[PDB]
Amino acid sequence: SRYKDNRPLNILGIDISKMELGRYNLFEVSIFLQGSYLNPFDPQEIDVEGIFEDQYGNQYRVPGFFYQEYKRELKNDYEYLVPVGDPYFKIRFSPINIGSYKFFIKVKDKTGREVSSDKYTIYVKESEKPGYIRVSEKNWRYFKFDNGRQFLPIGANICWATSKGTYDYDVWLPKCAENGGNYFRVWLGPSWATFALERESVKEYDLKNAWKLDYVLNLAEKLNMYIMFCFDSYNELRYQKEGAYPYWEHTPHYEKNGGPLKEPKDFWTNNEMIKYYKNKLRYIVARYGYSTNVFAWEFWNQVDIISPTAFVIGEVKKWHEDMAKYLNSIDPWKHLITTSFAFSPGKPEIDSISGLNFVQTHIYKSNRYIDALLSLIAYKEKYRKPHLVGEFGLDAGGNDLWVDPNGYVIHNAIWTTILSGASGTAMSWWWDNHIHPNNLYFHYRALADFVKDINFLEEKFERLTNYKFNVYNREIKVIGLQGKKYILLWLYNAKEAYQYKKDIPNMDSSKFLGSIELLIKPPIKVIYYDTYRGEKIKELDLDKNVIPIIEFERDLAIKIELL
Numbered sequence: 120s121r122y123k124d125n126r127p128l129n130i131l132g133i134d135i136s137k138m139e140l141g142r143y144n145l146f147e148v149s150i151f152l153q154g155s156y157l158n159p160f161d162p163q164e165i166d167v168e169g170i171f172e173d174q175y176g177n178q179y180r181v182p183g184f185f186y187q188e189y190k191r192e193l194k195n196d197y198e199y200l201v202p203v204g205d206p207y208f209k210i211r212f213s214p215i216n217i218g219s220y221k222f223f224i225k226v227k228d229k230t231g232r233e234v235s236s237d238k239y240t241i242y243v244k245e246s247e248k249p250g251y252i253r254v255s256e257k258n259w260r261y262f263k264f265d266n267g268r269q270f271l272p273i274g275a276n277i278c279w280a281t282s283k284g285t286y287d288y289d290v291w292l293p294k295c296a297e298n299g300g301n302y303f304r305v306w307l308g309p310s311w312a313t314f315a316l317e318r319e320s321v322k323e324y325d326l327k328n329a330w331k332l333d334y335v336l337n338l339a340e341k342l343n344m345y346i347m348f349c350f351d352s353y354n355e356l357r358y359q360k361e362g363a364y365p366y367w368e369h370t371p372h373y374e375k376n377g378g379p380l381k382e383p384k385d386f387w388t389n390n391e392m393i394k395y396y397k398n399k400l401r402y403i404v405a406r407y408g409y410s411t412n413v414f415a416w417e418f419w420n421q422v423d424i425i426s427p428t429a430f431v432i433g434e435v436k437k438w439h440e441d442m443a444k445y446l447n448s449i450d451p452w453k454h455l456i457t458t459s460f461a462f463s464p465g466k467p468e469i470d471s472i473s474g475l476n477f478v479q480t481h482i483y484k485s486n487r488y489i490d491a492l493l494s495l496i497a498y499k500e501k502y503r504k505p506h507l508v509g510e511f512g513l514d515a516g517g518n519d520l521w522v523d524p525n526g527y528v529i530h531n532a533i534w535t536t537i538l539s540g541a542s543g544t545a546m547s548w549w550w551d552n553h554i555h556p557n558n559l560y561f562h563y564r565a566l567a568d569f570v571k572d573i574n575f576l577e578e579k580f581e582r583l584t585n586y587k588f589n590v591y592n593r594e595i596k597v598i599g600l601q602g603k604k605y606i607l608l609w610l611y612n613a614k615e616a617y618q619y620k621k622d623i624p625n626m627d628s629s630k631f632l633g634s635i636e637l638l639i640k641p642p643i644k645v646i647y648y649d650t651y652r653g654e655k656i657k658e659l660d661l662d663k664n665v666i667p668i669i670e671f672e673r674d675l676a677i678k679i680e681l682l
């Protein structure tokens with residue numbers, strides 16, 4: 120109990136970040152206090168709350184959180200954080216309406232005594248921010264912002280840094296954002312992760328790693344990027360003898376290391392673990408929930424591959440239902456909630472729970488992965504909620520960077536997924552050893568520039584069907600979407616798309632290859648789009664439903680508009 124206090128409860132100071140701010144922007148209150156509590160991360164010991172009310176009478180109950188300021192530096196090849204001042208408590212709020220808000224601070228400690236502040240008034244003006252990310256009511260395949268504009272996630276996993284810590288995100292994130300990226304995913308466990316909250320304990324959370332997560336979230340805010348926070352990873356509950364980067368023997372949950380659990384199976388039902396997990400969820404909502412740059416709360420990375428001694432489908436299902444309900448109940452902004460599985464088809468008993476707002480796929484497959492992606496996307500339409508291909512790569516023991524230094528595998532997957540009806544791009548692994556050093560960001564820029572000017576929420580897009588190729592020299596295949604105004608096609612050469620040794624196509628391509636007939640009413644306008652340079656190649660007006668295919672090396676995109 121490093122941070123215990125044993126004084127009579129009193130507020131000693133309140134600092135307010137700003138008295139005027141914009142819609143969806145951060146309003147931060149700092150609270151200095153003394154009190155009686157053993158653990159500032161446990162609301163049964165000390166419960167700080169901010170109670171906000173807009174001019175329409177809507178109320179927001181915002182939990183407060185314990186905070187330590189740090190100043191970062193780089194010591195050669197590792198980040199080092201120097202503490203600045205004593206720790207204290209914070210409230211982080213974000214207004215969804217404009218106008219006036221009234222708020223006050225309340226504190227209760229373990230003695231039952233409660234203290235409170237004076238009522239304060241702040242004023243909120245309109246801003247440019249689009250709001251929080253939600254499921255689209257117009258098309259359940261897709262996400263939207265509160266203002267109604269679509270959110271199509273384009274990006275990659277960026278789940279942890281090297282020892283350089285936040286200094287790596289200073290490099291990766293601007294490159295991603297300047298190349299059309301608006302999405303990444305970070306890990307808050309296991310204990311070795313950059314942002315691990317349960318580093319040494321499951322009862323108290325790591326203030327240094329929480330500060331690093333603040334830093335990265337703030338960088339996302341400046342760059343208009345949106346983050347999935349993955350709370351726990353399967354390694355935590357996987358025994359050494361089971362392989363696959365196991366971590367049970369080292370995890371703070373295990374009794375050997377101070378935690379409540381004798382074996383990982385007990386995670387789902389142990390009363391003490393459940394209590395502390397809810398405290399962690401409260402801490403995460405308190406510290407990060409304000410942010411519209413939090414796209415989603417993800418409970419687990421690949422919960423299906425915890426130890427087989429520990430995976431009890433009915434227990435894991437109930438825990439997800441209960442935790443989703445709890446998290447929603449305490450999150451004033453109701454961020455999206457999800458979970459993930461290593462098994463590519465997922466676990467229907469869990470994926471179908473209403474409390475999980477969207478479903479995911481992880482897939483590492485080397486052969487015919489285009490067809491596998493399409494099949495999984497078609498299959499998961501049964502859930503009638505969005506689908507994110509949250510992890511993707513070859514099944515090559517991590518050798519993607521040697522097999523495919525030009526990123527053709529990523530290229531194929533991002534085009535396939537977007538134009539098959541997934542909510543956004545397939546999300547690559549290997550951000551640090553592949554995407555960045557091989558400078559693969561240009562693939563995302565080309566795709567973003569192709570899709571960004573179409574409102575996917577309103578096109579009534581369906582996976583393409585009723586097509587017929589007429590091509591003699593080659594084997595060309597298509598992944599497509601057909602909507603009420605646009606048809607989007609990705610064509611690929613089946614004999615070239617899965618070979619990765621040749622240099623990036625430098626198109627100079629005038630010849631006719633063949634045609635593809637679609638079930639459309641002319642007249643139409645046809646745009647041919649170079650998927651590597653990210654530019655229009657040619658434009659052609661047509662009076663029939665038969666699209667010439669111009670010459671291309673590997674793959675080519677086509678945008679058709681019903682006129």
Ligand SMILES: OC[C@H]1O[C@@H](O[C@H]2[C@H](O)[C@H](O)[C@H](O[C@H]3[C@H](O)[C@H](O)[C@H](O)O[C@@H]3CO)O[C@@H]2CO)[C@@H](O)[C@@H](O)[C@@H]1O
Pocket residue numbers: 279311354363364420421510548
């Ligand atoms: O350096 C941090 C950490 O690395 C751990 O090992 C990583 C691997 O380096 C690799 O990225 C692996 O990726 C997995 C990941 O588990 C994902 O969810 C899915 O399973 O597929 C990808 C590709 O296989 O992830 C592990 C962690 O699970 C480990 O070496 C730690 O000691 C080290 O601190």
